Structures are given as structure tokens and as C-alpha cells.
Design a binder for these strands. Structure first.
Length: 78
DNA sequence: TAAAATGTGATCTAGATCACATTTTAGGCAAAAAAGGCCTTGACATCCCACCTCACGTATGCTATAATGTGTGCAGTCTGACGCGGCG
């Protein structure tokens, strides 16, 4: 599953590899959200998988950029 | 020889005498008491300490139409010598 959907991970990743942090870190975090979605996904919902891990990936990257990527940590609320 | 010094002598005038009683008052010796030095007491004032203390802030979780191989805006190519790994 994971080795299959790596291209989803990288595709979504490089929408956000504008000069925020760096490519490969967005990619790696994307693989983390991917592994979550593989751990959680239900076939019985019968939907496509792409959407599910799209959400999960996007969460993971979207707050790893914010936790990291600065010398001064601004937490999520600000 | 000009100009300053020298005798008339009786009539006075501010202080000293002189023995003894009474003050004083030292000065200096004993000290009473008061006001510092010693401590205490009551009363205040201000805390240090810390002991709590709720609101706001913060660490973390999912969101099911679906979407799946970068690139990406740069460098302008300095150059002469010296090592080293191919390169026959």
C-alpha cells in the first residue's frame, strides 16, 4: 500500500514545497500521514483510498511545517 | 649773646596706715539624681513566604467524491599549477 501511494505523498507534498522549509521533509512527513491512513482506512466505507490519506497526509505536513520550520516555535493557535 | 635753665618757699592733696571682725568661697571632696548607655516591653507596620488558583494557553486528534516521477529559475563559463584516476 505505502510503496504504491508514495506518488500521492510526493504529489501533494510538492504543492507545499514552496520555499517554506524544504522538499524531502514535506515528503517524509507525508509518508507519516500515509502510514496513518494505511493503519486507519476501511474498505467497508467503499470509498477511494486517495481521499482518506489525502486528508491524513495533509494534516501531517500541514502541522510539521508549523511545529518545525522556525528557529522560534510559534504554537498552532497563533 | 640768644635762648633755654634755675632759684622763692609756703600752701596745699590723692593714697597709705593699721589691728581686727566677718564673708565667702572656693576648690575640691562626697554625692543625689538625671540623662545617656544598657536592656526590656508593647504596639505597629510591613512585609517575606509561600501557598494556593482560576483563565488562558497549549499539546494533541480527525476531516472518507477524488486527486499519484522533480525540474524551475539560477550559473556564467577567471586561470595557471599540481595531484590523481583513468586512459591507451
Amino acid at each position: 500500500m505505502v510503496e504504491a501511494n508514495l506518488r500521492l505523498v510526493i504529489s501533494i507534498a510538492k504543492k507545499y514545497t514552496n520555499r517554506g522549509l524544504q522538499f524531502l521533509d514535506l515528503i517524509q512527513e507525508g509518508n507519516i500521514g500515509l502510514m496513518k491512513a494505511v493503519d486507519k482506512f476501511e474498505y467497508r466505507r467503499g470509498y477511494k483510498f486517495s481521499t482518506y490519506a489525502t486528508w491524513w497526509i495533509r494534516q501531517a505536513i500541514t502541522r510539521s511545517i508549523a511545529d518545525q520550520a522556525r528557529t522560534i516555535r510559534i504554537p498552532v493557535h497563533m
